[PDB]
Design a binder for this molecule. Structure first.
Ligand SMILES: CC(C)CCC[C@@H](C)[C@H]1CC[C@H]2[C@@H]3CC=C4C[C@@H](O)CC[C@]4(C)[C@H]3CC[C@]12C
Ligand SMILES: CC(C)CCC[C@@H](C)[C@H]1CC[C@H]2[C@@H]3CC=C4C[C@@H](O)CC[C@]4(C)[C@H]3CC[C@]12C
Ligand SMILES: O=C1CC2(CCCC2)CC(=O)N1CCCCN1CCN(c2ncccn2)CC1
Lengths: 339, 55, 232, 218, 280
């Protein structure tokens, strides 16, 4: 039975990694950041409410100009909003209305969407014709597209419910790289600020760190007790926060290879649908199933504030690149910009 | 199977070969990033309504 | 993407004409089309504007009530009903497509135009310099003057730069001051503030020869500057 | 608002308009979530009605049905089954001739999937149009093979009527919260030609009963 | 004093009528789950009952407390017209709600394909139109310190049949066919226990339909039928029929109590309205 030898070897390696993490766990982040001045209570008010979606909003993504944001809803519409004025720049009709992810290209020339059709569709926002057209349909995933993120105009990484992420070449349409290793359904992605590598959370309660260019997994972070619905790097790219169904957000550090802090409250039982970081990284903003976003002090595990105002599960949220505003989409079909 | 378990063992071994800094150093780095950019975070510091584009 | 104009020709004064714009190759229904006319030896003058969905319509104060604009969205055709054609209506009539969302590029495409020969508070774009002589490969800057601050409180300066190449319809170069249009080489650049604007060409070629027009988009009398010709 | 900002507002309003027509057109759409076990006969159900998920559209007696077949989604239902929360009815396809077969028992797999879907938290008021496919192959197999292979506690005659009634009861008692939802069981093999009629009847029943619940009469 | 007690009772009735109907309209306006055709009709019924409770009821209470019409005669005619308009529209909103429920329950194809808020607007406008056609003729010509409705026999027939008896007949027929449809939908060891539970649930649903239709129709009838029976028989009774003051006032204020209770019947018993008020 060579499998027993391999299983025992894997258990030995897991114990080795656990002991290595414990060795570096000299002092918890909570201990270190007791002396730092806590932010008392931030009062963010809904500045804009984006109305026009007629079904549950499953994904929003901010433009790099911090003004345009794309949102995906089950009514089969991908809408690009001018959040400053609330104007709808584009309303993109999707071939499959079962979209559960949307990404807005950093250049702003494209949006991606995907979902139960197992296809990440790339839309050309800036066409010579005045319409937005599907520039590229990235087929190759055998599960639902749970997340997608543009590396650039031509490279896009897409997580899927087939337990594998994939890096795509949009012009060719082919999977440049496939990121296997997740046992559960991959539910989120977060690109690093340098875009050299990305994390991905799956239903196996494990967040894996993937090098984009070579295509293999640096690290695996296992601290969650339920499916990971949301993941986001710290702004410096040396840490990331996850959002799981167990009403817990965790901050994992890339270099320390270990969980640093847990953002949990006994009064929160619903799972997290989306997480995002403020520009300085001090605020962790987590959407919840209890219909409201809770803002956490990322360094003290203190709930600095709550963005109540959604009448259904807050399914997605994002902080602008300049950090001015937070837009929270939700299942009540309304996007709210907070500030 | 044999191939799957071998791949899993290979990945665990190659993950173990990572230089891990102390979590104290990592926490200090995160705190330093949060402090060096606290003035560039409009969410922490409520921006004046004149400088706020959402008003 | 092409716009083809129809109609035009010798018309007795006091008569009536319909100009047809057979748009083809783009989502015509989503564009707010314009008619911009140019006298046989003068600059551009904006005639009328019919928005996307025909909901909003403007006319030049010199033709308001006297011209009528309309679009056939199913047929992708834009119309200009003209009545009592005075002698001052003798102009090349350009159909211009223009789409307005955040970051859009209005006036990007212009139709070829139709010759039209009639028988015998506005912001003032000023191009004081005209007929600038220049050598290929040498930089040149074209000054633009505005009777009112084109910079809006939203941060956008609505100054447009067009290039009337000889024998060609205009071609958007800079749409909102310091914004290169699509297909324009990154040697043109727009600069200015408030009322004064400069279009600096880095290293021009034999293709940059032509007449460069200002245009304000702050209000809807769309006034053009008296074109600053460039010649070798 | 500048002139271009006014035209941008007009564009946003036109987009709002077209969103309104699209949403009103999608409101007149009867959404049906088609489930089953792939080899449970859902494919012939679609054939009678006429990768990723397959959206099937058919019109019957002025009702326009959208039937979303998600059997090809081998991924976790728990992450995308809430997308069909506002679905009118669930069309569950079960092959009757799977009581003896194995993937565990195929019929037991169908029953556990049916239990999960029926008592799902997203489908408390979503009635289920249960389809029992392959009734003629069930005829042939129940003539020879006994149903006790699937149900040890059956203790009944191995005729089509008793076996089919027991199977239907075993599926319909997996339905907790019987107050908020019904199950519309039907029997078909491959040529029933009234499966679309049964779906229409069940959907109109669902609609009428929701309207009755609105008035306080149900 | 009997004056101040009457003032307090009528004032609190008017206050809670205003409060209930305004709360229903506010719940419709604020909550996005409450904007649909049936809820549009119920909110419009609350609007009509709020117009009652604001424009008609304060003046009716003043006329009751002072026992005389202390205002002028042109305002007497204006408030007769306003009373007839508002109350006729409230009754015909009950009828429009019944018609909406009838079409929803008997025509599911119409409910899915053709039922739009434009239909709610059409029904609301039609009820208000009927109210105007019942209220204006006395102003157009169908006609002493006392304000009363035109007792003309032709106008008595026109205003009582066109505003309550045609509505009562329509509501009875519509809710009878809704009762038939609801009952049809209800009737249509371990197995024995499951059948017993199903039978008990069917009987519970039948009692639910009986109670719902009873509440609706009984509130409508016991509030308005006394008034319209009186308003039909007194104009045809020269002196054989004399109306006691107390009884006549109670019979008058029964319809106003109907305008008070219509929000209770149609919204405050509604699950979505109760949840929306919880949310607010
Ligand atoms: C002015 C006020 C008092 C008028 C209110 C009338 C109310 C209190 C009366 C009139 C008609 C009555 C209903 C008549 C019919 C039914 C159905 C019966 O199975 C249970 C009682 C029930 C549900 C009654 C409830 C109370 C009821 C609605
Ligand atoms: C629960 C509610 C709906 C029951 C209905 C209350 C109505 C019918 C009752 C409550 C208070 C009552 C009023 C109390 C005082 C008087 C003064 C008397 O000189 C004339 C009758 C009059 C004006 C009554 C009319 C009927 C009345 C308004
Ligand atoms: O108490 C008052 C005073 C007013 C002055 C302001 C207004 C109240 C005047 C007044 O008469 N009465 C007594 C009661 C009138 C009751 N309303 C019921 C509705 N009506 C109606 N509805 C449909 C068809 C025909 N009539 C008219 C009578």
């Amino acid at each position: 039975s060579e499998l027993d030898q391999l299983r025992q070897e894997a258990e030995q390696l897991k114990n080795q990694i656990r002991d290595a993490r414990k060795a570096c766990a000299d002092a918890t982040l909570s201990q270190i950041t007791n002396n730092i001045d806590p932010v008392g209570r931030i009062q963010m008010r809904t500045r804009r409410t984006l109305r026009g979606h007629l079904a549950k909003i499953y994904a929003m993504h901010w433009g790099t100009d911090s003004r345009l944001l794309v949102s995906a809803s089950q009514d089969g519409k991908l809408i690009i909003w001018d959040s400053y004025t609330t104007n709808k720049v584009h309303a993109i009709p999707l071939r499959s209305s079962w979209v559960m992810t949307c990404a807005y290209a950093p250049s702003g020339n494209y949006v991606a969407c995907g979902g139960l059709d197992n296809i990440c569709s790339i839309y050309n926002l800036k066409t010579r014709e005045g319409n937005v057209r599907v520039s590229r349909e990235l087929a190759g995933h055998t599960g639902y597209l749970s997340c997608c993120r543009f590396l650039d105009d031509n490279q896009i990484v897409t997580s899927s419910g087939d337990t594998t992420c994939a890096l795509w070449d949009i012009e060719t349409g082919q999977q440049t790289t496939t990121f296997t290793g997740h046992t559960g359904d991959v539910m989120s992605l977060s690109l690093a600020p340098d875009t050299r590598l990305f994390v991905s959370g799956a239903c196996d309660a494990s967040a894996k760190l993937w090098d984009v260019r070579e295509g293999m997994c640096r690290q695996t972070f296992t601290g969650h007790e339920s499916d990971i619905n949301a993941i986001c790097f710290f702004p410096n790219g040396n840490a990331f926060a996850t959002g799981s169904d167990d009403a817990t957000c965790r901050l994992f550090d890339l270099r320390a290879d270990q969980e640093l802090m847990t953002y949990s409250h006994d009064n929160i039982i619903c799972g997290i649908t989306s997480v995002s970081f403020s520009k300085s990284g001090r605020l962790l903003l987590a959407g919840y199933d209890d219909f409201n976003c809770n803002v956490w002090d990322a360094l003290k595990a203190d709930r600095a504030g709550v963005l109540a105002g959604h009448d259904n599960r807050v399914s997605c949220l994002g902080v602008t690149d300049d950090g001015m505003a937070v837009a929270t989409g939700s299942w009540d079909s309304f996007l709210k910009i907070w500030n | 199977s044999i191939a799957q378990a071998r791949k899993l063992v290979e990945q665990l071994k190659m993950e173990a070969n990572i230089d891990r800094i102390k979590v104290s150093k990592a926490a200090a780095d995160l705190m330093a990033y949060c402090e060096a950019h606290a003035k560039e975070d409009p969410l922490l510091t409520p921006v004046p309504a004149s400088e706020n584009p959402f008003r | 993407v092409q716009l083809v104009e129809s109609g035009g020709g010798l018309v007795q004064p006091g008569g009536s004409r319909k100009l047809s714009c057979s748009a083809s190759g783009f989502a015509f229904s989503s564009f707010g089309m314009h008619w911009v006319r140019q006298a046989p030896e003068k600059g551009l003058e904006w005639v009328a504007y019919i928005s996307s969905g025909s909901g909003t319509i403007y006319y030049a104060d010199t033709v308001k009530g006297r011209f009528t604009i309309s679009r056939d969205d199913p047929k992708n055709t834009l119309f200009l009903q003209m009545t009592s054609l005075r002698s001052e209506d003798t102009a090349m009539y350009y159909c211009v497509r223009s789409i307005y969302y955040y970051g859009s590029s209005p006036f990007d495409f212009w139709g070829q135009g139709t010759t039209l020969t009639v028988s015998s508070s506005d912001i003032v774009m000023t191009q004081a310099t005209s007929s600038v002589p220049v050598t290929p490969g040498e930089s040149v800057s074209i000054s633009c003057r505005s009777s009112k601050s084109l910079l809006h409180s939203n941060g956008n300066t609505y100054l447009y730069w067009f290039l009337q190449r000889p024998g060609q319809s205009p071609q958007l170069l800079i749409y909102r001051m310091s914004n290169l249009a699509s297909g324009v080489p990154d040697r043109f650049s727009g600069s200015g503030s408030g009322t004064a604007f400069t279009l600096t060409i880095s290293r021009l070629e034999a293709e940059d020869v032509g007449v460069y027009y200002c245009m304000q988009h702050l209000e809807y009398p769309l006034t053009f500057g008296a074109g600053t010709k460039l010649e070798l | 608002l500048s002139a271009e900002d006014k035209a941008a507002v007009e564009r946003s309003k036109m987009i709002d308009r077209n969103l309104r027509e699209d949403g009103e057109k999608a409101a007149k759409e009867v959404k049906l979530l088609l489930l089953g076990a792939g080899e449970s006969g859902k494919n012939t159900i679609v054939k009678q009605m006429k990768t990723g998920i397959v959206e099937t559209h058919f019109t019957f007696k002025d009702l326009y049905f959208k039937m979303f077949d998600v059997g090809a989604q081998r991924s976790e239902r728990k992450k995308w089954i809430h997308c069909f929360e506002g679905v009118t009815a669930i069309i569950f396809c079960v092959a009757l001739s799977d009581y003896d077969l194995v993937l565990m028992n195929r019929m037991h797999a169908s029953m556990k999937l049916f239990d999960s879907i029926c008592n799902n938290k997203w489908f408390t008021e979503t009635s289920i149009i249960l389809f029992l496919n392959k009734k003629d192959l069930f005829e042939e197999k129940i003539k020879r093979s006994p149903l006790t292979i699937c149900y040890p506690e059956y203790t009944g005659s191995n005729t089509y009527e008793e076996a089919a009634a027991y199977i239907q009861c075993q599926f319909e008692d997996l339905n907790r919260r019987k107050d908020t939802k019904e199950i519309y069981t039907h029997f078909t093999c491959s040529t029933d030609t009234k499966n679309v009629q049964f779906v229409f009847d069940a959907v109109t029943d669902v609609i009428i009963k929701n309207n009755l619940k609105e008035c306080g009469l149900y | 004093s009997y004056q101040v007690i009457t003032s307090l009772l009528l004032g609190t009735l008017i206050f809670c009528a205003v409060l209930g109907n305004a709360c229903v309209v506010a719940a419709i306006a604020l909550e996005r789950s409450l904007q649909n055709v049936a809820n549009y009709l119920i909110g419009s019924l609350a609007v009509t009952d709020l117009m009652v409770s604001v424009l008609v009821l304060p003046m009716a209470a003043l006329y009751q407390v002072l026992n005389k019409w202390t205002l002028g005669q042109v305002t007497c005619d204006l408030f007769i017209a306003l009373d007839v308009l508002c109350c006729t529209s409230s009754i015909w909103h009950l009828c429009a709600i019944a018609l909406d429920r009838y079409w929803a329950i008997t025509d599911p194809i119409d409910y899915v394909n053709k039922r739009t808020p434009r239909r709610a607007a059409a029904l609301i406008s039609l009820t208000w139109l009927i109210g105007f056609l019942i209220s204006i003729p006395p102003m157009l010509g169908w006609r002493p310190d006392a304000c009363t409705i035109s007792k003309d026999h032709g106008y008595t027939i026109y205003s009582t049949f066109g505003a309550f008896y045609i509505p009562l007949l329509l509501m009875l027929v519509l809710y009878g066919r809704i009762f038939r449809a609801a009952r049809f939908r209800i009737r249509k060891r371990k197995n024995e226990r499951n059948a017993e539970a199903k039978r008990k649930m069917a009987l519970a649903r039948e009692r639910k339909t009986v109670k719902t239709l009873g509440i609706i129709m009984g509130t409508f009838i016991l509030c308005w039928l006394p008034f319209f029976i009186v308003a039909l028989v007194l104009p045809f009774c020269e002196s054989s029929c004399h109306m006691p003051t107390l009884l006549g006032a109670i019979i008058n204020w029964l319809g106003y109590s109907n305008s008070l209770l219509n929000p209770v019947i149609y919204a405050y018993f509604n699950k979505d309205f109760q949840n929306a008020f919880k949310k607010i």
